[PDB]
Design a protein around this ligand. Structure first.
Ligand code: FE2
Ligand code: MG
Length: 309
């Protein structure tokens, strides 16, 4: 008695083996293949964050678990998961073409990024729907944002609440909370992209959630181009906040990400770790949601809401 529905889970993507780095970054660099120095430098980073294999598995587990859960909490519909990656196969157009091949006519999409943006979120849905239209007989509902989902905000609030309830008295009373997210060219300003503000909102909600009045909103993992990108970067803000206030500790919350990917493992656990260690401050970084049930639940709910269920 259950209706059938595809579940299109979209993510940025991560290579599956040290051997896919090249092509993966060529796609990010938009056709320009990295140089033997940079590329070789990248391999080092992965080899440093423990490896590449674990990253891609985290996203595959998120879709399975979300599908499986969505089918336990409700019985009106039966979901079938389809991962749609942006920079590494299976690409969004491949997952879509597949569902159609499996006889699915209804679908709901949910990208693994809480905020909305004309560059990433809306782009992912765009390409999906067009693949769908080009084939027909297959429709797709798409979730734009979900950073404001109680269960999601709460997942971070409790993490951050524990992080502050571990620091010694002097830190806990002289700390700074930093909410980050992937940076994007400032050019998205011309289209009213609510991305900047959603980041400020998740910030305010989480800081407001843990009873922390001291906090900031930074960006990170910005690409390289001539035109300006969203600022200030967490590294510049973490050193700027210090030189003026002298915080004894900084707790980072990469709310823009949901798994342990180079963006959090390196750009945070290292590069920001490099700066706190430089200014003599303590470094905190609550664990990412990943495939933890509290998170899975959070998403399930988001999907159910989009369907009026
Ligand atoms: Fe700001
Ligand atoms: Mg950087």
């Amino acid at each position: 008695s259950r209706k059938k529905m595809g579940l299109l889970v979209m993510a940025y993507g991560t290579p599956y083996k040290e051997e896919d780095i090249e092509r993966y970054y060529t796609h990010i660099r938009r056709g320009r293949k990295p140089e033997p120095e940079m590329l070789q430098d990248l391999k080092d980073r992965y080899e440093a964050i423990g490896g590449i294999s674990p990253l891609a598995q985290i996203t595959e587990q998120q879709a399975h678990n979300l599908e499986q859960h969505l089918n336990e909490i409700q019985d009106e519909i039966t979901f079938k998961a389809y991962i749609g990656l942006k920079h590494i196969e299976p690409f969004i157009e491949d997952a879509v073409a597949e569902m159609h091949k499996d006889g699915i006519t209804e679908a709901v999409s949910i990208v693994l990024a809480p905020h909305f943006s004309t560059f990433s979120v809306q782009s992912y849905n765009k390409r999906a729907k067009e693949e769908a239209e080009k084939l027909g007989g297959l429709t797709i509902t798409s979730v734009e944002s979900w950073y404001d989902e109680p269960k999601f905000v709460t997942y971070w609030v409790d993490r951050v609440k524990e992080t502050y309830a571990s620091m010694p008295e002097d830190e806990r009373e002289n700390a700074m909370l930093i909410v980050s997210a992937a940076s994007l060219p400032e050019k998205i300003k011309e289209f009213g992209d609510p991305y900047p503000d959603q980041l400020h909102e998740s910030a305010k909600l989480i800081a407001e959630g843990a009873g922390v009045s001291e906090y900031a909103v930074g960006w990170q993992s910005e690409g390289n181009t001539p035109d300006p990108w969203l600022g200030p970067d967490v590294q510049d803000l973490t050193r700027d906040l210090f030189e003026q206030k002298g915080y004894q500790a900084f707790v980072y919350v990469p709310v823009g990400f949901v798994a342990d990917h180079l963006e959090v493992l390196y750009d945070n656990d290292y590069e920001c770790k490099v700066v706190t260690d430089d200014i003599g401050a303590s470094y905190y970084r609550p664990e990412m949601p990943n495939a933890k049930p509290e998170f899975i639940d959070a998403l399930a709910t988001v999907v159910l809401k989009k369907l009026g269920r």
